[PDB]
Design a protein around this nucleic acid. Sequence first.
DNA 1: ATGGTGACGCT
DNA 2: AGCGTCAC
Length: 427
Amino acid sequence: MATGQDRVVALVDMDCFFVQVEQRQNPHLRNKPCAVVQYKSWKGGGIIAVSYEARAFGVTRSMWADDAKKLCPDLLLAQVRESRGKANLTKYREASVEVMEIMSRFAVIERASIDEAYVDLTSAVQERLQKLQGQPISADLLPSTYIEGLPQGPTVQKEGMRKQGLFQWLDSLQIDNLTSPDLQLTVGAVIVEEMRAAIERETGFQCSAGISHNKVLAKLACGLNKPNRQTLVSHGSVPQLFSQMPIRKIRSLGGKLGASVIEILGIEYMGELTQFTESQLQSHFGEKNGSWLYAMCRGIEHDPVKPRQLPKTIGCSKNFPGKTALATREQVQWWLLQLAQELEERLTKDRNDNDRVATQLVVSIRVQGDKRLSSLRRCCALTRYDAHKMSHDAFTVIKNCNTSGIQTEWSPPLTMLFLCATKFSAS
DNA sequence: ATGGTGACGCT
DNA sequence: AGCGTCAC
Ligand SMILES: Nc1ccn([C@H]2C[C@H](O)[C@@H](COP(=O)(O)NP(=O)(O)OP(=O)(O)O)O2)c(=O)n1
Ligand SMILES: [Mg+2]
Ligand SMILES: [Mg+2]
């Protein structure tokens, strides 16, 4: 029976990423409790990234900076750039490109977010194992690697524990067998050490990584020993790891589906799923989800690392909460123009860098009283990278929504505007 | 009043 | 197409 051990997959995730971008730029922020904040005026601004020094004080994301300062009076802050009246993330996108380009030298990557990429190292491992004629794997090749589940069986400090586990792992390895999945993961980890060394050397940024046989285990592994460490999760480690792993920790189960798995089956931990037949899981959660859960709780997943380094959409949005909701046509048109101007600049850059053009413009709004992320979503043709045309067109496709008799007024007021370019073609 | 991103499934 | 879920 298939054991889901055919691939070597890593997930690299940058440590407190936006903070590291700002600390590289401003040495005064290095090795300090510090956070990145967006929009100073309302409660000191919203925190969106937090250094590990600040995390020790209890500072978190989705905290107002005024409140964070109560937990950490010496907290240092770096502000997100604002342009055309809104937060602008260009600096972090550019830093992301630095890291993605380095990772791409080692293998084809799947960009999973601004600061994460999956890597399929199956081929690189095969070639490295051949150049490694015999040759045991030294612990010195794995200086920041944790082996999840080890040490076990018959030191009081972290690094001591890490080494004992690594020693047990390496001592047990079957280096004479090049088809051994554990051996393949170990070689994968050596390559990821090299990848992470290159990222830090060439950018100054530290990161963590997971190495396993699929994306979900690699992602889970990555978080086990953050920051600045990497973790190998073998197929064998899965039963003990999952036996006390809350279901919500597994990627895609952190929301309503995960909550329904818990409620419907009356379980708490990922490993408890093994008790159910594939048909039983499909009966509760659908064919796709059921099959996925049945395999995943056994450490098996087939979701491929997709060869994609570039985002498939480029979007610009702004919210206008509470009393600031947009109530005039002048207002709506001004802000659509602001969004369209940012989008134009990003699109033009994208076309020069990446030899493609977007062909569809998606416009989304939220009206006051409405409670969803988006109220109304409409698309139209994107034929010209011109901000005035795009903003004019967006207005055209959303002017239907103005239920107001007076058309110089806007009702109900708008609490969100969103412009997104999609459907890219080669150019 | 976290805000501003982005991928992908469903019908 | 437009809506919803899930994630950083
Ligand atoms: N809700 C969120 C989550 C992340 N981000 C941004 C800021 C983060 O630095 C960056 C990466 O997100 P992240 O990986 O979830 N956390 P971060 O890299 O800051 O810390 P780690 O826990 O990964 O060390 O995306 C955001 O702007 N809004
Ligand atoms: Mg990160
Ligand atoms: Mg991340």
